[PDB]
Write a protein that binds this ligand. Structure first.
Ligand SMILES: O=C(O)[C@H]1O[C@@H](O[C@H]2[C@H](O)[C@H](O)[C@@H](O[C@H]3[C@H](O)[C@H](O)[C@H](O)O[C@@H]3C(=O)O)O[C@@H]2C(=O)O)[C@@H](O)[C@@H](O)[C@@H]1O
Ligand SMILES: O=C(O)C1=C[C@H](O)[C@H](O)[C@H](O[C@H]2[C@H](O)[C@H](O)[C@H](O)O[C@@H]2C(=O)O)O1
Length: 231
């Protein structure tokens, strides 16, 4: 039988501050249900160690969505609210099967748009350089679809071992640290000033696959939302 993520101590802090959405944005498990052993092939403990997300289908997801702790409701914060908002993770991105082209593994999202997507991507040109098998950030600086609304950055080539991420938002600015190295330093997010519905996500969100049956798979060794206020 499949082992539940909550059978070990490692992920209990974040499971106390999340709901699981799967296979769409519909609720699959509340925080309480995650803490009490919710399990399936989309969401289980691998190697006794990794919180593993699996999902097939274009635009489908298996993702944790940040919640107020202790059974609270959806959280909502702002890039300019004066608080530092922090998420950390340690992620093993395995080699993906044929048909999977891009998997979003962390997000800053609001009521209506993704401010930040960190995604694995099989192949893409950025700024006239061709890159393969890598980790990318996509930041939105507007709501339109032309290329001027996005800032896209090569963060790192995918490694076989765990890669660590820290995301910080303070005073309308975004910083992304990858394996201890600051790669994105103070990206402007002031377009989003006043939007007070932002929240973190993490897991697997499958983008533009070429087969809807191909299963994306991501393993987390650590994940936390870091409260700079200690309630
Ligand atoms: O690859 C492209 O064709 C363009 O895709 C853009 O990123 C989009 C991404 O592929 C996802 O479709 C999607 O994720 C969010 C949606 O924006 C939407 O509001 C939905 O209701 O919530 C989704 C979520 O994040 O959970 O959104 C991306 C988007 O921002 O439109 C860009 O990478 C673009 O440059 C590219 O040409
Ligand atoms: O485009 C979406 O389907 C969508 C992307 C966001 O990341 C987020 O998952 C959002 O989810 C809402 C949704 O309305 C859902 O059905 C539920 O009632 O609340 C979600 C939420 O904000 O947590 O929709």
């Amino acid at each position: 039988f499949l082992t539940a993520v909550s059978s070990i101590d490692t992920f209990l802090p974040v499971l106390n501050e999340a709901k699981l959405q799967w296979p769409t944005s519909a609720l699959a498990a509340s925080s309480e249900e995650l803490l009490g052993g919710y399990v399936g092939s989309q969401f289980y403990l691998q190697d006794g160690k990794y919180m593993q997300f699996q999902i097939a289908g274009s635009s489908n997801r298996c993702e944790l969505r940040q919640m107020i702790p202790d059974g609270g409701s959806e959280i909502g914060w702002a890039v300019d609210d004066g608080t530092t908002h922090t998420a950390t993770s340690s992620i093993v991105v395995p080699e993906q099967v044929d048909g999977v082209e891009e998997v979003t593994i962390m997000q800053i999202h609001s009521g209506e748009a993704p401010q930040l997507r960190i995604s694995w991507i099989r192949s893409k040109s950025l700024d006239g350089v061709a890159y393969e098998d890598f980790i990318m950030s996509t930041v939105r600086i507007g709501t339109g679809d032309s290329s001027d609304n996005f800032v896209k950055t090569h963060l790192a080539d995918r490694t076989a071992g765990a890669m660590s991420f820290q995301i910080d938002v303070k005073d309308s600015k975004l910083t992304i640290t990858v394996n201890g190295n600051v790669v994105v330093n103070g990206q402007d997010l002031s377009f989003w000033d006043g939007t007070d519905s932002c929240y973190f996500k993490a897991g697997a969100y499958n983008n533009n696959p070429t087969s809807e049956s191909a299963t994306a798979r991501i393993k987390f060794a650590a994940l936390a939302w870091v409260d700079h206020h200690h309630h």
